[PDB]
Amino acid sequence: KTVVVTTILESPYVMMKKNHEMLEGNERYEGYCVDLAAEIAKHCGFKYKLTIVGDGKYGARDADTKIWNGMVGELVYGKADIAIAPLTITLVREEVIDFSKPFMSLGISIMIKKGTPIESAEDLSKQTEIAYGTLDSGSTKEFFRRSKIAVFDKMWTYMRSAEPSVFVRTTAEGVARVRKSKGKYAYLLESTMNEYIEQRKPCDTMKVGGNLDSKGYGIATPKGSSLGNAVNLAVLKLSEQGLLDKLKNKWWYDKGEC
């Protein structure tokens, strides 16, 4: 049987290739997670089809219906067999799906347009001129929603009520908002994506401050899946081979333009 893999279009994890129109199936895509999927499948010995998550989301639980959306939902409701994406290992997700040991470390970070007078999260929290937000239906938004840290709690109070809305539907929308806003919008996103974007033309954004937290991405499977054990061992093996480091260099710094 062919394993259905859910993933998400997010650079440089999964991107449409330049010449995709004349390519078919898995071939249409390239990126870190596309390379990772291929080695996972080889080591675990399965065939697979990459599918882009229908609703374009990572995954959160609707507070009223309790229904999961995004890639998490696809796993939970049996629409996909595995998710290979920059999907953050969190407590609420671990309660409903299984994660491999992390294949990448990261933390929440701040993206500004170059020249913006912001140096830290505390800086953002102490002013009103510069608006800031995060991605909808992701782990970053939940981080701020839940934080008991005075700075982050204060930021959340501001974000949850801001007008117009400071939240975005995709990372691309967030980055575009930063770029178009003349330094009046800052974007809270994962350090991995931040570091990638900082090295791509037009080279007008910057990661500022340290990471706000430390966590990891994992490969996710439905709870009790026959795949979970093999996938976990494969991640550890690839880590120890140095393959994960190699892929990181290939997609982040070999592809730098600035």
Ligand X SMILES: NC(=O)CN1CCCC1=O
Interface residue list for ligand X (CB under 6 A): 102-105, 107, 210-211, 213-216, 239, 244-245, 248-249
**Near its own copies by CB under 8 A, which window of 29-37, 77-85, 241-249, 250-258?**
241-249
Question: Which residue in 251, 245, 222, 10 sits closest to 98, CA to CA?
Answer: 222
Question: Is 26 exposed, middle or buried, given 0-12, 13-18 or 19+ CB atoms closer than 10 A?
Answer: middle
Residue 253 per-residue DSSP state:
I
- Residue 190 interacting entry, from Zn ion, ligand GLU, its own copies, none, C-beta within 5 to 8 Å by type: ligand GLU
Beta-carbon contacts of 91 under 8 Å, excluding residues fewer than 6 positions away, are: none
Cα separation, 82 vs 6, in Å, equals 6
In this chain, which of 100, 116, 139, 191 binds ligand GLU, going by CB under 6 A?
Answer: 139
140 contacts ligand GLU (rule: CB under 6 A): yes
Show contacts with its own copies in window 100-129 (CB under 8 A).
101-102, 105
CA distances from 183 to 133, 142, 187 (A): 13, 25, 11
The two tokens of residue 214 are: 């430390």
Show contacts with its own copies in window 126-155 (CB under 8 A).
143, 146-149
- The site that binds Zn ion (CB under 5 A) totals a number of residues, namely 4
**Near ligand GLU by CB under 6 A, which window of 121-129, 136-144, 161-169, 218-226?**
136-144
Q: How long a stretch of residues is the chain? A: 258
Cα separation, 189 vs 137, in Å, equals 13
**Near Zn ion by CB under 5 A, which window of 18-26, 49-57, 148-156, 210-218?**
18-26
Q: How many CB atoms lie within 10 A of CB 14?
A: 22
Cα separation, 191 vs 210, in Å, equals 9
Indicate the residue whose CB is closest to ligand X.
216
Question: Is 149 exposed, middle or buried, given 0-12, 13-18 or 19+ CB atoms closer than 10 A?
Answer: middle
- Residue 210 interacting entry, from ligand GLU, its own copies, ligand X, none, C-beta within 5 to 8 Å by type: ligand X
- Residue 58 interacting entry, from ligand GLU, its own copies, Zn ion, none, C-beta within 5 to 8 Å by type: ligand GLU
| End-to-end alpha carbon distance in the chain | 44
**Near ligand GLU by CB under 6 A, which window of 36-44, 109-117, 133-141, 205-213?**
133-141
| Residues found near ligand GLU in the complex (CB under 6 A) | 58, 86-88, 135, 138-140, 189-190
Question: Which residues contact Zn ion by CB under 5 A?
Answer: 21, 39, 62, 64
Annotated binding site for L-glutamate: 86, 88, 93, 139-140, 190
